[PDB]
mmCIF file of all heavy atoms in Angstrom:
data_model
loop_
_atom_site.group_PDB
_atom_site.id
_atom_site.type_symbol
_atom_site.label_atom_id
_atom_site.label_comp_id
_atom_site.label_asym_id
_atom_site.label_seq_id
_atom_site.Cartn_x
_atom_site.Cartn_y
_atom_site.Cartn_z
ATOM 1 N N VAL M 72 32.578 0.007 -27.344
ATOM 2 C CA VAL M 72 32.194 -0.766 -26.172
ATOM 3 C C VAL M 72 30.959 -0.120 -25.564
ATOM 4 O O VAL M 72 30.996 1.064 -25.206
ATOM 5 C CB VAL M 72 33.336 -0.837 -25.152
ATOM 6 C CG1 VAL M 72 32.972 -1.785 -24.032
ATOM 7 C CG2 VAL M 72 34.613 -1.268 -25.832
ATOM 8 N N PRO M 73 29.858 -0.836 -25.428
ATOM 9 C CA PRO M 73 28.658 -0.265 -24.814
ATOM 10 C C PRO M 73 28.843 -0.128 -23.307
ATOM 11 O O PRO M 73 29.878 -0.480 -22.750
ATOM 12 C CB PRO M 73 27.574 -1.284 -25.160
ATOM 13 C CG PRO M 73 28.308 -2.563 -25.287
ATOM 14 C CD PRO M 73 29.653 -2.226 -25.858
ATOM 15 N N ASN M 74 27.809 0.399 -22.656
ATOM 16 C CA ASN M 74 27.795 0.595 -21.210
ATOM 17 C C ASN M 74 28.950 1.490 -20.766
ATOM 18 O O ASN M 74 29.859 1.070 -20.053
ATOM 19 C CB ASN M 74 27.849 -0.741 -20.472
ATOM 20 C CG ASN M 74 26.874 -1.750 -21.015
ATOM 21 O OD1 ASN M 74 25.978 -1.421 -21.788
ATOM 22 N ND2 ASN M 74 27.046 -3.000 -20.607
ATOM 23 N N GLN M 97 31.573 -6.438 -28.877
ATOM 24 C CA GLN M 97 31.082 -6.685 -27.523
ATOM 25 C C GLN M 97 32.179 -6.695 -26.464
ATOM 26 O O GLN M 97 32.015 -6.017 -25.436
ATOM 27 C CB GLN M 97 30.288 -7.996 -27.500
ATOM 28 N N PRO M 98 33.296 -7.412 -26.625
ATOM 29 C CA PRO M 98 34.254 -7.492 -25.515
ATOM 30 C C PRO M 98 35.075 -6.225 -25.360
ATOM 31 O O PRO M 98 34.832 -5.223 -26.038
ATOM 32 C CB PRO M 98 35.139 -8.692 -25.881
ATOM 33 C CG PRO M 98 34.672 -9.177 -27.215
ATOM 34 C CD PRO M 98 33.773 -8.154 -27.802
ATOM 35 N N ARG M 99 36.054 -6.270 -24.466
ATOM 36 C CA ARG M 99 36.830 -5.090 -24.122
ATOM 37 C C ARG M 99 37.875 -4.791 -25.190
ATOM 38 O O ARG M 99 38.593 -5.690 -25.633
ATOM 39 C CB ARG M 99 37.507 -5.287 -22.768
HETATM 40 C C1 LIG H 302 26.198 -4.082 -21.017
HETATM 41 O O1 LIG H 302 24.962 -3.985 -20.301
HETATM 42 C C2 LIG H 302 24.024 -5.031 -20.591
HETATM 43 C C3 LIG H 302 22.761 -4.703 -19.830
HETATM 44 O O2 LIG H 302 23.051 -4.308 -18.497
HETATM 45 C C4 LIG H 302 24.630 -6.368 -20.192
HETATM 46 O O3 LIG H 302 23.714 -7.420 -20.471
HETATM 47 C C5 LIG H 302 23.617 -8.222 -19.277
HETATM 48 O O4 LIG H 302 24.684 -9.184 -19.215
HETATM 49 C C6 LIG H 302 24.664 -9.994 -18.031
HETATM 50 C C7 LIG H 302 25.887 -10.878 -18.088
HETATM 51 O O5 LIG H 302 26.057 -11.449 -19.379
HETATM 52 C C8 LIG H 302 23.360 -10.784 -17.962
HETATM 53 O O6 LIG H 302 23.322 -11.524 -16.747
HETATM 54 C C9 LIG H 302 22.167 -9.838 -18.034
HETATM 55 O O7 LIG H 302 20.956 -10.582 -18.088
HETATM 56 C C10 LIG H 302 22.273 -8.946 -19.267
HETATM 57 N N1 LIG H 302 21.170 -8.001 -19.309
HETATM 58 C C11 LIG H 302 20.667 -7.521 -20.451
HETATM 59 C C12 LIG H 302 19.530 -6.557 -20.314
HETATM 60 O O8 LIG H 302 21.114 -7.850 -21.546
HETATM 61 C C13 LIG H 302 25.932 -6.575 -20.951
HETATM 62 O O9 LIG H 302 26.551 -7.787 -20.536
HETATM 63 C C14 LIG H 302 26.880 -5.411 -20.694
HETATM 64 N N2 LIG H 302 28.100 -5.572 -21.467
HETATM 65 C C15 LIG H 302 29.303 -5.207 -21.016
HETATM 66 C C16 LIG H 302 30.454 -5.448 -21.946
HETATM 67 O O10 LIG H 302 29.457 -4.704 -19.909
#
Side-chain angles (χ1 to χ4, degrees), chain M residues 72-74 98:
Chain M
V72 187
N74 313 347

